[PDB]
Amino acid sequence: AALVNRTTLIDARRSEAMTNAALEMERSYRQYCVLDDPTLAKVYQSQRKRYSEMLDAHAGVLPDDKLYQALRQDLNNLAQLQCNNSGPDAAAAARLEAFASANTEMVQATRTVVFSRGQQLQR
């Protein structure tokens, strides 16, 4: 119980931190385009790196790698900040949408696994 609760808390918290970093990525990406603020380029990259490091630390929580591979593919294609008419350009907006969806799928798969730990045991 003490062991399952520690791994549950840590893995649940990591999934939440990944959502937070994904939110901050999109926020920085959009604000870079809206405000044309060159100082946000390094802020965005710091959040993308933060997300990537979490994703690597999260490897092994899931029983297969498909959801990781989708997110790694999206991260690999999210390096540049590309804007059109004071927002992300069309292709960038689509990349952000696919990345947010891949993150959601990974988070929900994580929470499914984590919260099923110990589920068969006497209550």
UniProtKB/TrEMBL annotation:
It is found in: Cell inner membrane. This is histidine kinase.
